[PDB]
Design a protein around this motif. Structure first.
Motif, short mmCIF file in Angstrom:
data_model
loop_
_atom_site.label_atom_id
_atom_site.label_comp_id
_atom_site.label_asym_id
_atom_site.label_seq_id
_atom_site.Cartn_x
_atom_site.Cartn_y
_atom_site.Cartn_z
N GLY A 25 0.82 -1.20 0.00
CA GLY A 25 0.00 0.00 0.00
C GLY A 25 0.87 1.26 0.00
N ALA A 26 0.65 2.09 -1.01
CA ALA A 26 1.40 3.33 -1.14
C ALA A 26 1.46 4.02 0.22
CB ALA A 26 0.76 4.21 -2.21
N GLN A 27 0.40 3.85 0.99
CA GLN A 27 0.32 4.45 2.31
C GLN A 27 1.38 3.85 3.23
OE1 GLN A 27 -1.25 6.77 4.17
NE2 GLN A 27 -2.23 7.76 2.40
N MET A 28 1.53 2.54 3.13
CA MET A 28 2.50 1.83 3.94
C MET A 28 3.78 2.65 4.11
SD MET A 28 4.24 -1.84 3.33
CE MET A 28 2.89 -2.84 3.94
N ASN A 29 4.42 2.47 5.26
CA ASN A 29 5.65 3.19 5.56
C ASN A 29 6.84 2.29 5.24
OD1 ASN A 29 4.32 1.70 7.63
ND2 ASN A 29 6.00 2.26 9.03
N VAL A 30 8.02 2.90 5.28
CA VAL A 30 9.25 2.17 5.00
C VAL A 30 9.38 1.00 5.99
CG1 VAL A 30 11.75 2.35 5.23
CG2 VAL A 30 10.49 3.99 3.78
N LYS A 31 9.24 1.33 7.26
CA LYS A 31 9.34 0.33 8.31
C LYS A 31 8.46 -0.87 7.95
CE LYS A 31 11.31 -0.14 11.71
NZ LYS A 31 11.90 -0.71 12.95
N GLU A 32 7.16 -0.63 7.96
CA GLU A 32 6.20 -1.68 7.63
C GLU A 32 6.71 -2.51 6.46
OE1 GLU A 32 2.05 -0.78 7.39
OE2 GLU A 32 2.25 0.72 9.03
N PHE A 33 6.90 -1.84 5.33
CA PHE A 33 7.38 -2.51 4.13
C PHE A 33 8.49 -3.51 4.47
CE2 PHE A 33 10.07 -2.45 0.22
CZ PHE A 33 9.13 -2.87 -0.67
N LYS A 34 9.41 -3.06 5.31
CA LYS A 34 10.53 -3.90 5.71
C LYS A 34 9.99 -5.16 6.39
CE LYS A 34 13.72 -0.09 6.41
NZ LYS A 34 14.69 -0.23 7.52
N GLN A 48 17.25 -4.70 8.39
CA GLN A 48 17.11 -4.15 7.05
C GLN A 48 17.44 -2.66 7.05
OE1 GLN A 48 14.20 -6.02 4.23
NE2 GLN A 48 13.13 -6.46 6.17
N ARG A 49 17.54 -2.11 5.85
CA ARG A 49 17.85 -0.69 5.70
C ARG A 49 17.77 -0.29 4.22
NH1 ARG A 49 23.55 2.68 6.77
NH2 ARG A 49 23.23 3.96 4.87
N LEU A 50 16.54 -0.04 3.78
CA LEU A 50 16.31 0.35 2.40
C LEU A 50 17.15 1.59 2.08
CD1 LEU A 50 12.53 -0.48 1.85
CD2 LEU A 50 14.59 -1.97 1.86
N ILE A 51 17.91 1.50 1.00
CA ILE A 51 18.75 2.60 0.58
C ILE A 51 18.42 2.97 -0.87
CG2 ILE A 51 21.14 3.31 0.16
CD1 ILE A 51 21.69 1.12 2.52
N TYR A 52 18.32 4.27 -1.11
CA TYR A 52 18.02 4.76 -2.44
C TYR A 52 18.76 6.06 -2.73
CZ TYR A 52 14.96 6.17 -6.30
OH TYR A 52 14.47 6.53 -7.52
N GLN A 53 19.45 6.07 -3.86
CA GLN A 53 20.21 7.25 -4.26
C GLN A 53 21.35 7.51 -3.27
OE1 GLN A 53 20.69 8.35 -7.03
NE2 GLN A 53 19.28 10.05 -7.50
#
Length: 86
Positions: A25-34, A48-53
């Motif tokens: 869900g676009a609403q979902m947050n980074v944390k949740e997604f993780k 985890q630690r989503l990294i972008y750019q």
């Protein structure tokens, strides 16, 4: 499960050339997604630690916010990952 084409796509490229598309869900947050992918990746959010750019995606932040829709994020796993693994 997951019916109807409604949601934001998010890819994750580990440190082993392994892109995995995810529909959250676009609403979902980074944390949740993780926590969501945490299942697939099998890695805990705290690990985890989503990294972008070359930036660390904030937990409180959301995927959409960053606009990682259909984009390839760079997830990193804390501690030195094992070669064999299993």
């Amino acid at each position: 499960g997951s019916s109807g084409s409604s949601g934001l796509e998010v890819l994750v490229k580990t440190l082993d050339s392994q892109t995995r598309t995810f529909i959250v869900g676009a609403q979902m947050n980074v944390k949740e997604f993780k926590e969501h992918i945490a299942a697939s990746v099998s890695i805990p959010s705290e690990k985890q630690r989503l990294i972008y750019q070359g930036r660390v995606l904030q937990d409180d932040k959301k995927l959409q916010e960053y606009n990682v829709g259909g984009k390839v994020i760079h997830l990193v796993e804390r501690a030195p990952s094992g070669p064999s693994s299993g």
